[PDB]
Structures are given as C-alpha cells and as structure tokens.
C-alpha cells in the first residue's frame, strides 16, 4: 500500500485501491516510463472473467451484493456467453460502466463531475446516416446553447465476425490543416492528416485557419462516407481580450464543445470502438496547448509583438507574459459568450476535492501527475504538491489503433 | 526491447539503450507508477567497485589494458585486507562528475564536465571542515560569477563515525515559530533552526537571517560555526517597473549549495560532499517565494499589483508569479550574480539530451522535475518524453543525522 503525501499541508494517505489494479502499465522497477503519452503499444474464457468482475462491483455500488438479482444476473451472462460468445449489457450497467470509465481516467482533471453524465444508448444504430443523427443529437444536447452538459453516445459493441463502428476524426469538432508549397500549414497542424483523408474522400477544401472539418463516419465494413456539420450545430467563440483592443483583430476563434471521438470504451470485457464523449474545456487546453504549442497554432510570438514585449531575450519572460494574456482572452471570450469553461485554478482545486472524496469512497484514486498538473503555473495549483499513484482500473477508456 | 522515446514538438524518435544498464531499482512496478513520489557486504562492494573502475578506464579510452587489470586486482586485494578501498584522485574527479551527469532531476547537466572537485578526504576535524567549506563558498561564489564545485570529505569507513553537514544547504534562512502559530522566515528550515538554537546559536528575529553551520566530525556532537557575512553574497529583490516591490524587503542568496546528500562512487559512500552551482530563476521566484508552504508572497504581490483577487479566472496568481520571477532575474543581473531563466535552462537541457544520446545512448531524466513549475509547456522539455532510472555514481538521499 503506497504512502502518498501532500507537501503543501503535510498530510499522508495510503492508496489501497492500487492493489486492485489489473492491466499492467509501462513501468518496471528498473526504469519509469510515466512520461510517455502512449504507453507501450496499442478461447473466450477471458470474457467471462472481466464480465463477472464488472457485474460484481455494479451490485456493490447499489448495496445489493449478496442474495437477490445479484445471484441471478451472474447466471444470465454465463448463459448468454455460453450460447453466443458475447453478451449484452443491461441499460443501467451500461450507464454505470460509462461513468466508471470516466472516474477511472487517470489523466482527467475534471473527474469531480463523474457522477453527472448523460449516456445516450446508440447500440441499435446500424447505419452511417444513423450514427450522424446520433452524433448530431449529442452535439445539440451537449452544447445546449453554451450551457454545456457532459455526454457520451455509445454505439454498438464490437462483435467477432467482421464489423466496427468508428469515427475517423479525433474529435467531433476539428479545424482544418492545409499543407502548401512550404509544407507549412494554414490551420491546425494536428489535423493535417485527417484534412487529407477528408479531401481524398470528396471534401471541398476551404478558406483558412479555422474551417470546421467534416465528419468521416464508418458503419461496419462499408467504407467511410463524408458528413457535413451544420453551422448552427457547431457553436464557436471568437476570441477577444478585455483590455487589448487589437486582440480580436487577430481573427482567433475556438469551438465550444470538446468531444473526443477516437477512444475505445471498455466495459466488462466488451469493447465499444465508437463511443464519443464530451464535456467542457479547461481554458489552458485552448489558450496554452492549442494556440501556443509550437506544433499547433504557435501564436505566442505574434501576440508578444502586439504587446510590445522584449522578444530579444528569454529573460524578459515575454513568452510567459503573452501566454497568460492569451489565457485571459480565452476565459473572457467564453464567459462573454456564456459558454461553459473552467480556469485551471478552479479545476485543480475541484480535483483535490475529488481526491479527498475518492479516498473515503474507494481508498484512493488513479492519477497521472504529468497530465493533472496544468501546462502553465503548475506549482501555483494545489495538485502540483500532491503525490499521486497511477494504475489502470476497469471500466476504462483506452487508446485504439486508427482505422487505416 | 529498449524504451522508445518521442519528442512531440518536432517528431524525433530515439531509443534509450542506456536504461538497460540500470544498476538499481526504483519505486515503480507494472501494477502502478510512483514516479511522482519525492522520496522513492564484501562481494557486492566488489561488483560496484569493478563496475566503476570499468567506467573510469573506459572514459580514458584505456579499457581492458594492463593498467586497468592491475587496478582491478589492486581493488579486490585492498577489499580483502581492509574491507574497503581508496579512490585515486583522478577516479574521484571522474566519479564526482558522473554523479552529477547521472542525476535525473537536474536540469543543469549540460555543465556536468565543468565541475571543480576539491579533495578534502584528509580532513580531520569539524574546524578543518569549516575551513574547507568557507574556501568552497568563496571559490564558488567568485564575487557573483558563480562556478560549479564540490568538496569531498572522508568516506564512510568501518570503525569511525561519519562526517556530516547537518544543514541541508550551506546558506539557509532561519525559520522561527511564532505567537500566531506561524513561521517567521523560511518555513522549510524550522527544524534546523531549532537545532541551531539549542546548540548555542543566538537567534535573530528577521525573515532573512542566515543560519550557522552545524558540522559533525566522526563520533563528535555537531559543532556550531558562523558564516562570515562577507562570505555570503546576497541579492536584494527589486522590480524593473514595479518600484513598490523593493519596499517588500525581499532577498535571496547567490549560491545554491546542497550539503546533505550522499555521494556514492564504486560502492564507497561519502556522506559529506556539498556541491553548488547557480540558481535557475524559478527555484527562487516560483518555489521559494510563492509556494504556500514557503514564503507564500503571491497574494501580497497581487494585492499590491491591484489585481482582482476575488476570482481565479482573472489569473491574478499567474500574473503575480510572472512578475516575481521578472524581479528575481532583473535583481540578479543588476547585482552581477549568475542566474539562468527556465527558457534558457530547458533549451540547454535539450542540447544535453542530444549530446547524451550520442555518447551513452540515452539519459536518465525525471520529467516532473525537469519541467519548470511555471510555463511548463512553453519550454521544450514539456514535449519531450523521458525515461527515469538510476545509474551510479550517484547522489543519493540519506536520513537526517538527528
Ligand atoms: C466536464 C469537464 C471535463 C474537463 C474539464 C476535462 C478535462 C480533461 C483534461 C484537461 C484532460 C487532459 C488530457 C489532454 O489534455 O489531452 C482530460 C483527459 C481525459 N478525459 Fe476529461 N474532462 C472533462 C470531462 C470528461 C468526460 C465527460 C470524459 C468521459 C466520459 C472524460 C474523459 C477523459 C479521458 C479518458 C481522458 C484521458 C486522456 C488520455 O488518456 O489521453 N473527460 N480531461
Ligand atoms: C550550475 C547550474 C545548475 C543548475 C541550473 C541546476 C538546476 C537544478 C534544478 C532546478 C534541480 C531541481 C531542483 C529541486 O530539487 O527542486 C536540480 C536537481 C539536482 N541537481 Fe542540479 N543544478 C546545477 C548544478 C548542479 C551541480 C553542480 C550538482 C552536483 C555536482 C547538481 C546536482 C543535482 C542533483 C543531485 C539534483 C537532484 C536533487 C533531487 O534528487 O532532489 N546540480 N538541479
Ligand atoms: C471530454 C473532454 C474534456 C476536456 N476538457 N477536454 C477534452 C479534449 C482533450 C482530451 C481529453 F480530455 C481526453 C482525451 C483526449 C484524446 C487523447 C489525447 N492524447 C492521447 C493526445 C483529448 F484530446 C475532452
Ligand atoms: C547545486 C544546486 C543548483 C541549483 N540550481 N539548485 C539547487 C537547489 C535545489 C536542489 C538541487 F538542485 C539538488 C538537490 C537538492 C536537495 C534535494 C531536494 N529534493 C528532496 C527535492 C536541492 F534542493 C542546488
Ligand atoms: C509531488 C511532486 O512530485 C513534488 O511536489 C515535486 C514536483 N516537481 C518538482 N520539480 C522541481 N524541480 N522541484 C520540486 O520541488 C518539485 N516538486
Ligand atoms: C512528454 C509528455 O508526457 C507529454 O508532452 C505530455 C505531458 N503532459 C501533458 N498534459 C496534458 N494535459 N496534455 C498533454 O498533451 C500532455 N503532454
Ligand atoms: Cl482540444
Ligand atoms: Cl533553494
Ligand atoms: Gd506600438
Ligand atoms: Gd512603475
Ligand atoms: Zn513510473
């Protein structure tokens, strides 16, 4: 049982939940690989063992372990797999597992919200036109005129026998990335590849550096087809600064809804390759990572020139000063547009509260320090001084290969 | 079967073949990562020794020669007869540099080859120990043009106790418990401060009182030594454009000199071997002054800056912290005291990573300690995956002698 200390307060706890960790991560006694983004690389007897485990903690979470339907639900799954090789989740189990996956996500700092999650069951979907309509309900429900609500849509599980629902975009809302004669990009460089596949599947390329891409939706077997997102469904925030009047003229925008559409949800040994989930942004994601990373929009220098900062020397801290104001403008712009956003101080403080809750509830919490600490002002947030244990629990969101 | 390591800013990919030689085991398992934890006979002495002598005779491009094989035979002979062995001076200098080179949380290792090694292994008492330390501080400080240095006191040896420096650094500010239950000065130094007082030190009452040295000779109680004021170069803090900042009365010292770690070379242990470099500005501005459990000045500065501290989304913390760091850099440059900012320091560490990949096939690096505590992803080490493992020679933690 690892001893975990908070250096700001001096308090000590023990992570007993780590003992119950299963799918081993990347580290060994000889070397630590915690800083790697994708760890390592990406007879149905093993299906019954994960299904029974998952069914077990479901009845634990409603008191009703011991006698009653708990005994009985164990049989249906045993029979369902003996007869078919797989099994179907009861609607509430699918809800419980979807929330557990989010609760167990070590890299997510917003897990204080894990109990409030809207789970659309799209398991009877059997068409790429049908998915699109599901995806559009979600986006409309999640966005909710800017009062964001966390939501996930669960498309049908993978079944042995040829067939996989899949979204090809990494997110539901992505900005285009246009190569050109320099090789340099106009738009989002992280989306150069998918902008390529969008064009080579028919898409009409666009204007400039903030063009919402079309979706590439893939019903089982039959190849992907292009779908266009209606402009009124993609809510976007133009970026302005409360006191730097020229900032709006930079023409910067970002969208309202962060909706990850390329991870695999795994519940009780079942695999859902299309299960797009969505929440609301923390502002450093937009201001710091999306707009200021050198391999993203890389705007830092341009904002510094406008601020008349001494870009001739690193010791002026001109990068730090410009980055803060970008984050100021992001927070101001989403607020002025009445769009849910959370600053990194508010988020980390709520995560500490989530840590304390989980200590009482489950005796610990998996957390990946490197992703929990924000990308600016790290030691100014309370999570920086909190030691954390990282390990994999199920149900979980997992990374999955790409459909090409 | 070597870890594959990507840089995400640029797309580079390397493989850390050196991690395979990891000569000790850390806290992680496949079940759980513990990377974020701050604190993670004759036949084994012989194999550590044999591995160090091999390293030394590789570096002078003389591997497997007779000189090499003689030294190996010399060492195990000396281990049989005495239970231990003595390093030659050249082996000691190499071992001190390798320990710095091998330290995974050090962002300043581009400098590892430029280390001045003072051999104090003939030291005999606490009083001579004090003299060696003053020389070290004076040489390393160098009137503000700081030079990296280490002084090595005698090794742990059967029969006799250890030399120990009780202070965690050569220069520390006193931390006094208060009436408010609070602390006056640096809260990290409350313990050593109480130790000093009860060993005869007459305490001050300011926020920046330099502490005396508590120096332990073998099988002796610790002895109290005062540092001459003119040996401790200090820097008052001011801001280039916030002129009320100078009225805060803030100071920090020039020389960061860690004095409580154990230096390990070929199985030999040096419990007293203080080493010093120069500060990176975030250690002072962000951690020492802004940590809530340190001087905790962040809200004071922000209030004075007329920031809106009612709400966190004004980012008043980030703005105050940036300006405190600006003041640190400006102040040290004005005082003509060496200092590096986190951008220049992380850029030079990236170069170190590239030098090390060509030389040894990799580099032990602790990401959470290499990435600076402000502006993390604005520096290039943020997007560099790293591999953390323990090589020897090494600086190691040790328990406090009290
Ligand atoms: C409600 C507000 C939420 C906030 C503020 C938030 C914030 C974040 C942030 C900042 C990360 C860091 C990873 C990165 O930057 O790429 C993250 C990771 C993650 N989030 Fe959340 N999130 C929220 C909701 C959700 C929801 C609703 C789900 C799923 C149902 C979710 C699942 C995940 C997962 C699986 C990761 C792991 C990322 C990875 O492994 O690459 N989050 N979250
Ligand atoms: C000359 C410029 C130097 C710079 C800019 C520098 C910077 C740093 C920084 C910023 C850290 C992490 C700070 C912390 O623990 O909070 C660190 C750790 C460390 N440094 Fe360096 N350092 C320098 C010189 C040296 C020298 C001369 C030595 C020894 C010969 C050394 C050995 C170490 C060790 C062993 C650690 C690990 C501490 C631990 O495990 O907690 N450094 N350094
Ligand atoms: C639901 C949600 C809330 C929020 N605040 N932000 C996002 C986008 C960031 C993000 C995540 F959080 C989680 C996962 C991914 C994809 C994996 C990212 N890795 C592998 C580069 C992501 F890109 C999503
Ligand atoms: C030589 C030097 C240069 C520089 N730039 N900073 C320092 C002080 C920080 C620091 C180190 F670097 C190395 C070691 C310690 C002590 C270990 C503290 N561990 C538990 C966080 C330290 F506190 C020393
Ligand atoms: C809990 C956490 O690992 C701890 O507070 C670390 C994080 N990274 C750090 N990095 C540096 N350079 N110095 C520190 O003191 C710390 N503290
Ligand atoms: C190499 C390193 O692990 C990588 O750059 C990580 C670090 N921490 C991160 N943290 C968040 N929230 N998002 C990221 O993309 C990353 N990138
Ligand atoms: Cl994003
Ligand atoms: Cl320090
Ligand atoms: Gd101007
Ligand atoms: Gd002024
Ligand atoms: Zn690890």
Q: What per-residue string of b and e applies to A296-321 under the rule 16 or more CB within 10 Å gives b?
A: bbebbeebbebeebeeeebbbbbbbb
Cα(B63)–Cα(B68) distance, integer angstroms:
7
Cα–Cα distance list, A28 to A106, B30, B32 (Å): 19, 6, 9
Closest CA to B168 of B258, B291, B93, B296: B258
User: Which residue's CA is the closest to the ligand 4 atom numbered 15?
Assistant: B258
Q: Which CATH class is domain A124-149+164-235+399-403?
A: alpha beta
Identify the experimental approach: X-ray
| Chain B contact set for A324 (CB, 8 A) | 315, 318-319, 322
CA of A370 to the centre of ligand 6 (A): 7
Resolution (A): 2.2
Which token pair is B349? 């560490």
Ligand nearest to the CA of B259: 4
* Sequence positions preceding breaks in chain A, C–N over 2.5 Å: 42
Closest CA to A138 of A276, A239, A240: A276
Query: Around B108, how many Cα atoms within 13 Å sit in the side-chain half-sphere?
Result: 19
Active site annotation includes B134: no
Active site annotation includes B28: no
Q: Identify the CATH assignment for A15-123+150-160+264-278+348-372 out of 3.40.50.10440, 3.90.340.10, 3.30.750.24, 3.40.50.2300.
A: 3.90.340.10
Q: Which CATH class is domain B234-256+279-344?
A: alpha beta
Nearest-Cα distance to chain A for B366, in Å, is 9
Which token pair is A86? 């797989």
Q: Which helix (H) or strand (E) holds A93?
A: helix A91-103
Cα(A245)–Cα(A203) distance, integer angstroms:
36
Cα–Cα distance list, B195 to B13, B128, B253 (Å): 51, 22, 22
CB spacing of B35 vs A31 below 8 angstroms: no
Nearest-Cα distance to chain B for A179, in Å, is 17
Active site annotation includes A280: yes
Asked whether B279 lines ligand 4 (CB < 6 A), one says yes
B16-122+148-158+262-276+346-370 CATH fold: Nitric Oxide Synthase; Chain A, domain 1 (3.90.340)
CB spacing of B31 vs A319 below 8 angstroms: no
Asked whether B36 lines ligand 5 (CB < 6 A), one says yes
Considering the candidates B71, B109, B172, B184, report the single residue annotated as catalytic. Answer: B109
A236-258+281-346: CATH architecture: Alpha-Beta Complex (3.90)
Cα(B353)–Cα(B366) distance, integer angstroms:
12
- What stretch(es) of chain B map to CATH 3.90.440.10? 123-147+162-233+397-401
Cα(A177)–Cα(A194) distance, integer angstroms:
8
| Residue pairs between chains A and B whose CB atoms are closer than 8 Å | 204
Superfamily (CATH H level) for B123-147+162-233+397-401: Nitric Oxide Synthase;Heme Domain;Chain A domain 2 (3.90.440.10)
The SS3 of residue A77 is: helix
Q: Between A9, A33, A317, which is nearest B325 by CB?
A: A317
| Chain B contact set for A346 (CB, 8 A) | 312-313
User: Which residue's CA is the closest to the ligand 1 atom numbered 42?
Assistant: A108
Active site annotation includes B290: no
Cα–Cα distance list, B72 to A100, A245, B75, B98, B227 (Å): 59, 73, 5, 19, 43
The SS3 of residue B165 is: strand
Asked whether A279 lines ligand 3 (CB < 6 A), one says yes
Pocket of ligand 2 (CB under 6 A): B 100, 103, 105-108, 111, 115, 148, 150, 275, 277-278, 280, 283, 340, 345, 369, 395
- What stretch(es) of chain A map to CATH 3.90.440.10? 124-149+164-235+399-403
Closest CA to A212 of A250, A243, A256: A256
Cα(B185)–Cα(B252) distance, integer angstroms:
12
Asked whether A277 lines ligand 3 (CB < 6 A), one says yes
Cα(B140)–Cα(B121) distance, integer angstroms:
19
Cα(A110)–Cα(A278) distance, integer angstroms:
12
Asked whether A7 lines ligand 5 (CB < 6 A), one says yes
CB–CB of A300/A322 below 8 Å? yes
Instruction: Determine phi and psi for B258, rounding to 5 degrees.
Output: -80, 125
- What stretch(es) of chain B map to CATH 3.90.340.10? 16-122+148-158+262-276+346-370
Cα(A367)–Cα(A370) distance, integer angstroms:
9
Asked whether B175 lines ligand 4 (CB < 6 A), one says no
| Atom number, ligand 6, closest to the C-alpha of residue A371 | 10
CA of A299 to the centre of ligand 7 (A): 16
CB–CB of B281/B329 below 8 Å? yes
| Atom number, ligand 3, closest to the C-alpha of residue A170 | 16
The SS3 of residue B118 is: strand
User: Which residue's CA is the closest to the ligand 4 atom numbered 24?
Assistant: B256
Considering the candidates A102, A168, A254, A280, report the single residue annotated as catalytic. Answer: A280
Place of tokens 């073998």: B218
CB–CB of B178/B197 below 8 Å? no
User: Using CB atoms within 10 A of its CB, is residue A78 exposed (0-12), middle (13-18) or buried (19+)?
Assistant: middle
* Sequence positions preceding breaks in chain B, C–N over 2.5 Å: 40
Tell me whether the omega of the peptide bond preceding residue B393 falls within 30 degrees of 0, making it cis.
yes
The number of residues making up chain B comes to: 402
The SS3 of residue A341 is: strand
Asked whether A350 lines ligand 1 (CB < 6 A), one says no
CB–CB of B97/B113 below 8 Å? yes
């Amino acid at each position: 049982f690892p001893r975990v200390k908070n250096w700001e307060v001096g308090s000590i706890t023990y992570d007993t939940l780590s003992a119950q960790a299963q799918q081993d991560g990347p580290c060994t006694p000889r070397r630590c690989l915690g800083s790697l983004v994708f760890p390592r690389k990406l007879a149905p007897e093993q299906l019954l063992s994960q299904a029974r485990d998952f069914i077990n903690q479901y009845y634990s979470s409603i008191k009703r372990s011991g006698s009653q339907a708990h005994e009985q639900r164990l049989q249906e799954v045993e029979a369902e797999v003996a007869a078919t090789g797989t099994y179907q989740l009861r609607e509430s189990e699918l809800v419980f597992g979807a929330k557990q996956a989010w609760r167990n996500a070590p890299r997510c700092v917003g897990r204080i919200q894990w109990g409030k999650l809207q789970v659309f069951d799209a398991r009877d979907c059997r068409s790429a036109q049908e998915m699109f309509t599901y995806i559009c309900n979600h986006i409309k429900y999640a966005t909710n005129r800017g009062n964001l609500r966390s939501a996930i849509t669960v498309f049908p599980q993978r079944c042995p026998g040829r067939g996989d629902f899949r979204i090809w975009n990494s997110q539901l809302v992505r900005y285009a990335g246009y190569r050109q004669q320099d090789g340099s990009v106009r738009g989002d460089p992280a989306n150069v590849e998918i902008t390529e596949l969008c064009i080579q599947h028919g898409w009409t390329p666009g204007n400039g550096r903030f063009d919402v891409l079309p979706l590439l939706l893939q019903a089982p077997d039959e190849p992907p087809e292009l779908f266009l997102l209606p402009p009124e469904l993609v809510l976007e925030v133009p970026l302005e600064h409360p006191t730097l009047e020229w900032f709006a003229a930079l023409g910067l925008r970002w969208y309202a809804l962060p909706a990850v559409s390329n991870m695999l949800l795994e519940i009780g040994g079942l695999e859902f390759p299309a299960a797009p989930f969505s929440g609301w942004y923390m502002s450093t994601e937009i201001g710091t990572r999306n707009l200021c990373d050198p391999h993203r929009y890389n705007i830092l220098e341009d904002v510094a020139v406008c601020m008349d900062l001494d870009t001739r020397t690193t010791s002026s801290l001109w990068k730090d000063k410009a980055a803060v104001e970008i984050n100021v403008a992001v927070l101001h712009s989403y607020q002025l547009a009445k769009v849910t956003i959370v600053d990194h101080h508010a988020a980390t403080a709520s995560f500490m509260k989530h840590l304390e809750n989980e200590q009482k509830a489950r005796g610990g919490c998996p957390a990946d320090w490197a992703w929990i600490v924000p990308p600016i002002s790290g030691s100014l947030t309370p999570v920086f001084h909190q030691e954390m244990v990282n390990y994999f629990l199920s149900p979980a969101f997992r990374y999955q290969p790409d459909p090409w």
